Amino acid sequence: PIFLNVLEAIEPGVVCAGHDNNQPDSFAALLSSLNELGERQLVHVVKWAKALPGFRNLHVDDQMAVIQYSLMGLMVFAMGWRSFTNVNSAMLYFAPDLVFNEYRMHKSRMYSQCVRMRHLSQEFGWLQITPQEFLCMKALLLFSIIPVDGLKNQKFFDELRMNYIKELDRIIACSRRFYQLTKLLDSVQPIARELHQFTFDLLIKSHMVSVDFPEMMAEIISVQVPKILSGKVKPIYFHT
């Protein structure tokens, strides 16, 4: 079980948002905290992806590309499992110091998106998603979105991706499970995209609403996210 050992070995631990939970729940406070959490989680995603089997074969620019594109989806997917395990999908467990209840969902101004995410969090339950299936679905999420006119070494990418699907095959060992898990991974992408849209817009209007973006995230949002939004970069979907 050499592959599965690695995934669990490299799984990130708890990341806090640094939230001030004595502050009354203002939109700006919440989103200035979500953004900081973004960056914290990004850092942990960089460390993880590097210790990822084969990841290092990718040309370096593809590594950076691929992480920036997937970031949201990874954050979203993991968050849904965290929320499931920790609080049984009652609330959104972004971090320990940052759990969204219905009021916070309304307050963030991303209620529709949140309900989507809460729903997915329930799915880890409705499907009895093993922790081994989750870990491996989450790896496959990093290979689930690419610029349409391809990466620098697209072939080394396609190998890696088709090999992460072989691993999921073994974690499923039965044809019917694959239907559902692949359906579950597709659900992430619409959500990632709504988040991406919201986030992007927020950056533009951010000086007028007092929301605070860490340098690195503002750059990513202004440089990579537009490509997703402009259709240059597109998720790989199993279905439809």
């Binding site: 960089v46 370096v60 590594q63 950076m64 992480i67 920036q68 340098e215 690195m216 750059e219 990513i220 440089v223």
Partner: peptide, 9 residues
């Protein structure tokens, strides 16, 4: 890019 310099250090 600040992500580039961070990514490779």
């Amino acid at each position: 890019y600040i992500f580039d310099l961070f990514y490779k250090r």
